[PDB]
């Protein structure tokens, strides 16, 4: 395959990227959500789509198994973005990285334990607050951790806050804003610029509105 | 909560554990698959259930946020089981860890690159074969990696082989057999043995048939 391979993840990123792609002349020929398939052609024969776990988008792009991808800033901060180029903030899948814990619970006076998927972000954020924390690596359902005493706080993405509130948790700190970013393989950017450029220019134009 | 907290994961482990629990006098009062809730009571007021990602079951048990759990041997090998007790092989969710690649593709004569979730298992297995491999950490959809040239082989769990065959892959090596195991927190085993013992004895009796 000589064209461009685009890495996306299911749910919000796929849904919110599709209008950008459509305006750039690229449409999927079926719903990837209803298929076990992982490689999908598009209306443009020079563009195909991989459907990946959000965590794996940076990895496929870095290695060049995809030429470009749409990844959350949260995932990029955690993975490290040093071996891809971040070209555009697409302003989609907007949310916040936050700390949270049981509503009105006092923090213990000791080294804190942070239950999170975002281990590097947690360590970096608490380092800025003057705290060298322990982290408990989890892969999902962070909202449960404080309810069963696994760690003193969590770090997770928050949008509406409904998940926190549903579980009797409240946000303690805003860490940063998160949105999805267009990342490109550093070699693909040099070798396939002629294919990438009109798509990048389209995305840039679309996000300006 | 003074009773026992049991960690399970959705899908096969939950489905195949339920008959064992039922025979031990423990039944869920609703389908956890149809709820956003993560803590569930049971017919026994001394037992509650956490529904976790399979990757997080060992973590909750190790820290004592759950007293015991059902985890795949694959997850235990990868996580490390040094700070929990593995008490029973429950003989459920049976599968194999295997290596696989594109059908009839020759291996390149260089350091191999293994795309896998099971990074520690991959390194250990290839070490037994006299190979010091590079690993590309992925979180899902391992079957895609060889189709886009991400790594030379994958390590993943295989049951029927249908996923491999669907994607033009074939298993190369059998690494080991996998089944779900009953793990216990090392402190809970000492402090709550009176609550655990009849349940463990029930499970043991059930699996003998
Ligand atoms: N509630 C939300 N609102 C808006 N954007 C969100 C929200 N939650 C997550 N995101 C963003 O969307 C990205 C992808 O989320 P997605 O749900 O696909 O990932 P995930 O739940 O980590 O996947 P997995 O099933 O592998 O655990 C996140 O990395 C983040 O940037
Ligand atoms: N096809 C299979 N047949 C039987 N047992 C399996 C199969 N695939 C996985 N297992 C076993 O079941 C366990 C749990 O699998 P499950 O699908 O819940 O995890 P997962 O796909 O890693 O979860 P996640 O959604 O977090 O990626 C595995 O760790 C393994 O031991
Ligand atoms: O602040 P809120 O609006 O409640 O959203 C925050 C939640 O969104 C994400 O879950 P998602 O909706 O992706 O479901 P998942 O965790 O099952 O993937 C994330 O894991 C948070 O739990
Ligand atoms: O050899 P097979 O019978 O094809 O099974 C192997 C597959 O089973 C598991 O997937 P699962 O069914 O758990 O779905 P998931 O990967 O979407 O979780 C695993 O991730 C393999 O892909
Ligand atoms: Mg999600
Ligand atoms: Mg699975």
UniProtKB/Swiss-Prot annotation, chains A, B:
Its main location: cytoplasm. InterPro entries: ATP_PRibTrfase_cat, ATP_PRibTrfase_CS, ATP_PRibTrfase_HisG, ATP_PRibTrfase_HisG_short. Gene3D superfamilies: Periplasmic binding protein-like II (3.40.190.10). Its EC number is 2.4.2.17. GO terms for molecular function: ATP binding; ATP phosphoribosyltransferase activity. HAMAP family: HisG_Short. Pfam families: HisG. Keywords: Amino-acid biosynthesis, ATP-binding, Cytoplasm, Glycosyltransferase, Histidine biosynthesis, Nucleotide-binding, Transferase. It catalyses: 1-(5-phospho-beta-D-ribosyl)-ATP + diphosphate = 5-phospho-alpha-D-ribose 1-diphosphate + ATP. GO terms for cellular component: cytoplasm. GO terms for biological process: L-histidine biosynthetic process. It is found in: Cytoplasm. Pathway: Amino-acid biosynthesis; L-histidine biosynthesis; L-histidine from 5-phospho-alpha-D-ribose 1-diphosphate: step 1/9. Lacks the C-terminal regulatory region which is replaced by HisZ. It comes from Psychrobacter arcticus (strain DSM 17307 / VKM B-2377 / 273-4). This is ATP phosphoribosyltransferase. Belongs to the ATP phosphoribosyltransferase family. Short subfamily. It is an enzyme of class 2 (transferase).
């Amino acid at each position: 395959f000589l064209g461009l391979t685009l890495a996306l993840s299911k749910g919000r990123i796929l849904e919110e990227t599709m209008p950008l792609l459509r305006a750039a002349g690229v449409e999927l020929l079926e719903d990837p959500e209803a298929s076990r398939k992982l490689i999908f052609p598009t209306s443009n024969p020079n563009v195909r789509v991989l459907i990946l776990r959000a965590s794996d988008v940076p990895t496929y792009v870095e290695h060049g198994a995809a030429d470009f991808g749409v990844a959350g800033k949260d995932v990029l901060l955690e993975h490290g973005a040093n071996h891809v180029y971040e070209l555009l903030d697409l302003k989609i899948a907007q949310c916040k990285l936050m700390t949270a814990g049981v509503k009105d619970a006092p923090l213990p006076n000791r080294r804190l334990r942070i239950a999170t998927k975002y281990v590097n972000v947690a360590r970096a954020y608490f380092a800025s607050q003057g705290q060298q924390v322990d982290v408990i690596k989890l892969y999902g359902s962070m909202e449960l951790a404080p309810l069963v005493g696994l760690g003193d706080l969590i770090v997770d993405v928050v949008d509406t806050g409904n998940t926190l509130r549903a579980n009797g948790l409240e946000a303690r700190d805003h860490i940063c804003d998160v949105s999805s970013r267009l990342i490109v393989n550093q070699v693909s950017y040099k070798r396939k610029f002629a294919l990438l450029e009109p798509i990048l220019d389209s995305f840039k134009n679309s996000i300006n509105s």
